[PDB]
Amino acid sequence: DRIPLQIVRAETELSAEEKAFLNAVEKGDYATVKQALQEAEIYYNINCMDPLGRSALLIAIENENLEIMELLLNHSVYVGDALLYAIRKEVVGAVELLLSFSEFTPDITPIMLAAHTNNYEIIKLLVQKRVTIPRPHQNCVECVSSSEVDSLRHSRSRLNIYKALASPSLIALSSEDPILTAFRLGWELKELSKVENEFKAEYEELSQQCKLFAKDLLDQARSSRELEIILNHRDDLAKLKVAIKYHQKEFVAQPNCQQLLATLWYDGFPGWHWVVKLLTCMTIGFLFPMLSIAYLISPRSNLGLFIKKPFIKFICHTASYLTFLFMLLLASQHIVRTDLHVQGPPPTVVEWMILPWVLGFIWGEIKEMWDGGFTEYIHDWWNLMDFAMNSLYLATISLKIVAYVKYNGSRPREEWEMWHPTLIAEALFAISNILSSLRLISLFTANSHLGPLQISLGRMLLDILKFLFIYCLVLLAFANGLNQLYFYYETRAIDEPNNCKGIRCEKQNNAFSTLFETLQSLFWSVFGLLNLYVTNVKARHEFTEFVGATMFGTYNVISLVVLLNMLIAMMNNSYQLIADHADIEWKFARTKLWMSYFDEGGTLPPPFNIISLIQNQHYQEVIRNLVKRYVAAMIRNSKTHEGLTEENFKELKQDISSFRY
């Protein structure tokens, strides 16, 4: 009825004299400790540990007392890890004095611990002693052997090294240019989280730390000349392009960089109501062909130089695409019309006028791909869409020529086979029209209202496919079951009214007769477009019809009462996390869009497209001042927590006592 309590693992008991010694050391009594040390020296332990494991030097370090610390250091030995304990507490005097069971993993070195503490003064003190830190590897024989010998130690050592390397103080102190080092280190740490799945959080935190350090270093500029020097440094805005390559979104979206980019973008438009802006945009767009011919004839003329402005060039490109879409509208109305019975018809007028635009788009896309390379082309999701639409256009053009060559006579439409080339050409043309009209979504990024919504929608598309996978699995299961049940009662087309078979008839029938038809029927029941009498059978077998109706009802419940609402909930959760960063991502996308019109390579719109020492010296001077303000800034920003002035006041009393004796 009682539980005894005993000490299962007991340490060596300390003697009474040692206990008094340790109590005197903790109490900070110099006289008693000095007398105890003297009587121990002349009578004969100095290196005893308390149950917590702290030797007398450790308590001296923890008590922030220098006098008895020197007292033991003069008489005692076995410093051990006292330097690490002094560094962790961030005491400058004790660390300097030391330079002049363990709580730490054995691979820790003083420099890496100082980097971990992110103390600039201690790091600077240690660096002057010619210390060095190993460079971690990226897959050799040694790496493999160490992994087999001890995986835990290997991973922990790598993590410790990478935490030491990612300290802002170390980068600010021992790097030629901290901005490029921060960019590269952040990218490398980001790539490491995808390989080391177990420790992903730590690596993402380190990469975020590097990005924040780079942005904060950029934040210290005080004049426009310094900003230009930093942004234009080359090892054209080379630094901005390097930041874009490394996905430095916080760095790029800084207000000063955005102001400079907006100044470059709205050149020739000083002080850019919205109605006046709309009128100016429409007026410039209406005159795009004349500007294009003016640029073609003579770039030296003022009219030729007029299109070189990025904003006017963007307006001209948008106007050209809008003209192409409008002329696509004309074809859909079939103003010219066709006999409909010509098996191969010559192209109408509208098709001839359309033809140059398609060739210009193909030329632009192929030139872009050739210049960028395969990898850059694969990186852009919009480029894939352009490739698909251009392939569809090419297929339509080839099929029209094939149909014209193959056939010479005329025939009524109702007699042609289903795979006639003309029908495929028309279907592909319609699909290409639909795809071409949807390309205007990529222009929403230039608007302050529409652009954030476009970015957020793009960010949430990953999870929708994740749900469509589960929906496809459930649909396949239920389609298999229903087709297995209902395939014994297939009828013929001639046995139905109007000779129509399937669910696209006036009266739906044969809904679950074939697997393809079962999939089509189950797809359309999501929108309530499948009627309920399709579960009936001509033979009137009530058990089979009841089972089929129950299967259909179970599918309806699962698909509409459960999965749709879970999709709603997950979309709600994902959007909230995404919303906190919408502005930064939108501005990153917008500055990506702006920079594509800065070059002079593609000035012509698509229809007409067919016809060094002193730099480094200045960069170092600005970097020397940016780092100086950074270390000053975050110390004062860390003074929101500095109430230790009174403890220093006690140090003043101690200095007065030292002057006294």
């Binding site: 660096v127 830190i133 190993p134 102190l173 021992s174 790097s175």
Partner: peptide, 8 residues
């Protein structure tokens, strides 16, 4: 390995 350096 990389050697750290600071760049009466």
């Amino acid at each position: 390995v990389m050697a750290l350096k600071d760049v009466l």
